[PDB]
């Protein structure tokens, strides 16, 4: 969920079932890259693997070096940077 | 957790969180005495945004559950349940 305000630009993701250990955020050029992987090999009667990949092009008026990520209690991953004005 | 298994006296069930998936994108298969589940969701806007979401799972069916009477359902809360009565 891309969000373009006047003041900032953010990218919000629901990652409720991934711990911070299982998430990675990278920036290369003007592209934000996000990945998550969680596994529950629960015994001999079950398993589940969950995965997501995301790429988001950064607006031209946002310096890619000013980018930061964060995770909240509600289980949301945000990648954001201020817009240069 | 995104998954829980639950044994009652009348039924067996497996609950799953699949909130971000539409019914079209989900697949429930009963393979003998094993349940297999799969979902894949992709949103592309070139050349600006890409999100890809995937899950894969398998569970063993208890001996007193007939694989043939296993049904699945999807709720409005975005929850997938695979359930079968017991014998």
From Swiss-Prot, chain A:
Residue numbers of N6-acetyllysine PTMs: 26
Cell compartment(s), UniProt: Cytoplasm; Nucleus; Secreted; Lysosome
Tissue distribution: Lens as well as other tissues. Expressed in myocardial tissue.
Sequence ranges assigned to domain sHSP in this UniProt record: 1-85
Annotated site residue numbers, Susceptible to oxidation: 2
Binding residues for Zn(2+) 1: 17, 45, 53
Residues at which Zn(2+) 2 binds: 38, 40
Recorded superkingdom: Eukaryota
Family: Belongs to the small heat shock protein (HSP20) family.
Associated pathology: Myopathy, myofibrillar, 2: A form of myofibrillar myopathy, a group of chronic neuromuscular disorders characterized at ultrastructural level by disintegration of the sarcomeric Z disk and myofibrils, and replacement of the normal myofibrillar markings by small dense granules, or larger hyaline masses, or amorphous material. MFM2 is characterized by weakness of the proximal and distal limb muscles, weakness of the neck, velopharynx and trunk muscles, hypertrophic cardiomyopathy, and cataract in a subset of patients.
Assembly and binders: Heteromer composed of three CRYAA and one CRYAB subunits. Aggregates with homologous proteins, including the small heat shock protein HSPB1, to form large heteromeric complexes. Inter-subunit bridging via zinc ions enhances stability, which is crucial as there is no protein turn over in the lens. Interacts with HSPBAP1 and TTN/titin. Interacts with TMEM109; in the cellular response to DNA damage. Interacts with DES; binds rapidly during early stages of DES filament assembly and a reduced binding seen in the later stages.
Described purpose of this protein according to its UniProt entry: May contribute to the transparency and refractive index of the lens. Has chaperone-like activity, preventing aggregation of various proteins under a wide range of stress conditions. In lens epithelial cells, stabilizes the ATP6V1A protein, preventing its degradation by the proteasome.
Name this polypeptide is given: Alpha-crystallin B chain
Organism this protein belongs to: Homo sapiens (Human)
């Amino acid at each position: 969920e891309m969000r373009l305000e006047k003041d900032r630009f953010s990218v919000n993701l629901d990652v409720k079932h991934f711990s911070p250990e299982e998430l990675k955020v990278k920036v290369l050029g003007d592209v934000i890259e996000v990945h998550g992987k969680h596994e529950e090999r629960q015994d001999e009667h079950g398993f589940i693997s969950r995965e997501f990949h995301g790429k988001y092009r950064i607006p031209a008026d946002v310096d890619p070096l000013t980018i930061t990520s964060s995770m909240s209690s509600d289980g949301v991953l945000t990648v954001n940077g201020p817009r240069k004005q």
